[PDB]
Amino acid sequence: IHEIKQNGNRYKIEKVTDSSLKQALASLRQSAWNVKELDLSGNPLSQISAADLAPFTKLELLNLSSNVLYETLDLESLSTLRTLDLNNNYVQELLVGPSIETLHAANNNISRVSCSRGQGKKNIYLANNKITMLRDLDEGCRSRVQYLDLKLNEIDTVNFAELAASSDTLEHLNLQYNFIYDVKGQVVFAKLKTLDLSSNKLAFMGPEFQSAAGVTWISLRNNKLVLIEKALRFSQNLEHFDLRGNGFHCGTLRDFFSKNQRVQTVAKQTVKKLTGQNEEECTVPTLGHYGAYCCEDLPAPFADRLIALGHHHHHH
Numbered sequence: 573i574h575e576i577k578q579n580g581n582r583y584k585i586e587k588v589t590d591s592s593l594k595q596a597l598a599s600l601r602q603s604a605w606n607v608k609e610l611d612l613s614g615n616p617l618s619q620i621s622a623a624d625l626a627p628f629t630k631l632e633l634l635n636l637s638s639n640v641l642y643e644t645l646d647l648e649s650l651s652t653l654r655t656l657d658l659n660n661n662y663v664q665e666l667l668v669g670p671s672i673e674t675l676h677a678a679n680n681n682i683s684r685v686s687c688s689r690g691q692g693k694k695n696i697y698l699a700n701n702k703i704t705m706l707r708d709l710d711e712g713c714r715s716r717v718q719y720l721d722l723k724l725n726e727i728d729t730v731n732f733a734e735l736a737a738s739s740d741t742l743e744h745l746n747l748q749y750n751f752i753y754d755v756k757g758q759v760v761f762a763k764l765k766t767l768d769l770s771s772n773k774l775a776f777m778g779p780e781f782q783s784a785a786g787v788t789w790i791s792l793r794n795n796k797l798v799l800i801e802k803a804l805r806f807s808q809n810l811e812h813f814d815l816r817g818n819g820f821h822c823g824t825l826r827d828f829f830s831k832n833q834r835v836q837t838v839a840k841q842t843v844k845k846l847t848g849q850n851e852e853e854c855t856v857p858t859l860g861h862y863g864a865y866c867c868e869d870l871p872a873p874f875a876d877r878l879i880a881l882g883h884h885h886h887h888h
């Protein structure tokens with residue numbers, strides 16, 4: 573009782589099941605040359621094979637969203653596919669081909685993504701999955717990325733070098749709501765416009781952040797920052813700078829802002845825009861401010877001790 577609706581070279585199939593999918597696709601194969609987009613969203617499909625889709629050699633867009641796909645979705649052999657949407661499924665491991673330009677795969681169980689070597693740019697949407705490290709994405713998936721959304725995953729650390737194959741293409745990196753406690757790596761991201769590392773667990777905004785010197789928008793809101801690398805410099809591009817919700821030593825703010833006066837101004841404007849106030853509200857009134865941010869006097873080695881003792885164990 574399945575239905576194949578159609579509009580030009582774009583087809584949609586409804587009321588299909590694992591048991592009737594094979595038949596539906598046979599019917600579709602009758603006009604395979606005209607199949608540029610196939611929409612299978614909303615069904616109870618629990619699996620689909622590249623082999624099933626192999627005969628559709630002109631297929632550029634495939635929509636599998638809101639099915640019940642699980643385990644491995646391997647479509648690496650669909651050489652023509654440019655856009656794949658499997659939002660809202662249960663996929664654990666995902667493999668896609670050399671023509672992928674846009675990959676929507678939010679709200680799955682994904683812990684592994686692989687992308688065949690390609691030449692174009694990639695936009696990758698992986699919010700709300702089970703990614704625990706950037707190397708869960710293979711090197712193809714980390715090359716020539718333009719937009720990368722990894723929010724609401726379980727990433728523990730970040731090494732910018734692992735994104736070096738996107739140094740010239742990456743424009744947006746969202747890593748908010750992970751559990752990142754350490755960042756390192758020096759990469760010149762020539763095109764990076766936005767970096768979101770808010771709601772992670774960072775204690776030190778270190779020299780690695782020169783990798784983001786050129787951004788327009790950056791947030792480390794609601795981390796656990798105590799210190800900032802005084803040598804960091806941002807550019808005139810910066811319009812949004814959010815370090816609210818941390819635990820800064822006053823000295824570190826004085827040092828950093830002393831050589832980034834315009835950043836101090838951007839910080840104040842950013843807080844004003846978001847809360848209607850020129851400074852953030854502190855949790856403990858025994859706290860003052862340096863510019864817009866709360867801070868405490870952690871002179872001597874107290875600040876360094878908070879950072880070291882924050883992770884008093886060997887490095888994984």
Ligand SMILES: *[C@@H]1O[C@H](CO)[C@@H](O[C@@H]2O[C@H](CO)[C@@H](O)[C@H](O)[C@H]2NC(C)=O)[C@H](O)[C@H]1NC(C)=O
Nearest residue numbers: 611613614633634635636637638655656657676
């Ligand atoms: C894949 O199919 C889903 C479901 O039809 C699309 O999601 C909808 O997108 C349209 C247009 O953007 C919205 O009006 C609907 O509200 C969305 N529905 C849901 C449940 O999100 C989705 O856009 C399609 N993906 C692609 C890449 O075409």
